[PDB]
Amino acid sequence: LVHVASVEKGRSYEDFQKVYNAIALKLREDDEYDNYIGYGPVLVRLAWHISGTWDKHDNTGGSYGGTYRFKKEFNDPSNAGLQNGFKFLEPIHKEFPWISSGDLFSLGGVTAVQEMQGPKIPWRCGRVDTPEDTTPDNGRLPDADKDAGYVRTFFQRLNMNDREVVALMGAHALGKTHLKNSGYEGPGGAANNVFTNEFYLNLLNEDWKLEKNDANNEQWDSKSGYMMLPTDYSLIQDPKYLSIVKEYANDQDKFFKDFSKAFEKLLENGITFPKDAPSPFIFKTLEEQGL
Ligand code: HEM
Ligand SMILES: Cc1ccnc(N)c1
């Protein structure tokens, strides 16, 4: 199974910048969502979950086909809550019907990171919608109740190595866990709609207490009112992961650089880009455009 990127016919950088801008303007407008967090975090999570179904062994799943639009995937228990992100993107898709679903969902994540003052994330177009029978079965996204060995093995299916895993997990500074979605509750830190290295600082510097929450699941809770999943906490239990956590806690610029690379890789897994495809796009923020 090969998925070759195919640019939406007649479209170029400036067209995709317009889609970026529409997402970014709506992010600005819809500032009350989830008790004033806004939609940035859920859009990042959506971009990751539509990509994280990939299996490197047979090229099933991945962002290419836009299959989250089909009920089997939309209704995956692992995706509970992401319907909010999908609904946010609906008016964007109506305004720009020419964009593919996978391009829209992945671009939502890029837009969110940049508009939350994160690093620039280069982004490539050309994902092509595939039919309902190409939708991956549920169960390919990761469990949260597990240890470092589970995390390492899981992410190897996505061709991610230790540095990429630790960098990607820094997105857990964003947003919050919701008991009704996942059986976990609380934020990872204070600045949960601005992209920073706070996840790593909090892992290292907070006083964490293992507790069983109201859904009967174990999570690590700090005196400051933050939480970590068991899979998050595993990053300071495993010696190799811990070394990288320290690096990113000490150097936000390095975290930004590594996150940008890993997130682009995640969003592009499974896609073959022809050697004459456009170079990756770097979208201007609204601020950079005076909008
Ligand atoms: C071992 C891997 C991971 C596990 C087990 C995991 C698990 C979870 C869980 C249980 C939630 C809470 C969902 C809810 O209750 O609404 C969550 C939220 C989130 N996840 Fe992860 N995650 C993983 C990796 C990632 C990665 C790689 C990214 C992106 C780079 C990511 C981005 C996010 C974001 C931004 C949220 C907040 C969403 C919101 O506020 O609505 N996660 N994750
Ligand atoms: C919001 C969030 C998600 C996952 N892990 C955390 N520590 C925080």
**Ligand 2 pocket, 229 CB below 6 A?**
yes
Q: Could you give the 3-state DSSP secondary structure of residue 10?
A: coil
- Could you tell me the CA-to-CA distances from 236 to 33, 77, 192, 250 in Å, in that order? 32, 28, 21, 15
Distance 274 CA to ligand 2 centre (A): 36
CA neighbor of 271 nearest in space, from 56, 105, 107, 92: 56
**Quick one: which ligand is closest to 45's CA?**
1
Provide the 8-state DSSP code for 79: G
Q: Could you give the 3-state DSSP secondary structure of residue 272?
A: strand
CA neighbor of 173 nearest in space, from 154, 155, 194, 145: 194
β partners of residue 209: 221
**Quick one: which ligand is closest to 83's CA?**
1
Residues 59, 270: contact at Cβ < 8 Å?
yes
Rounded to whole angstroms, the Cα distance separating 23 from 91 reads 9
Distance 45 CA to ligand 1 centre (A): 6
CATH 2.40.50.140 fits 1-141+263-291, yes or no: no
Rounded to whole angstroms, the Cα distance separating 214 from 272 reads 45
Among the CATH numbers 1.10.420.10, 3.40.718.10, 3.40.50.1820, 3.40.50.2030, which is that of 142-262?
A: 1.10.420.10
Give the mutation target among 45, 83, 106 for probing the ligand 1 site: most ligand atoms within 8 A of CB. Answer: 45
Q: What are the domain boundaries of the chain?
A: 1-141+263-291, 142-262
Q: Could you give the 3-state DSSP secondary structure of residue 271?
A: strand
Tell the residue nearest (CA) to atom 5 of ligand 2: 172
Cβ burial 73-84 (10 Å sphere, 16+ → b, else e): beebebbebbeb
Burial of 58 (0-12, 13-18, 19+ CB in 10 A): exposed
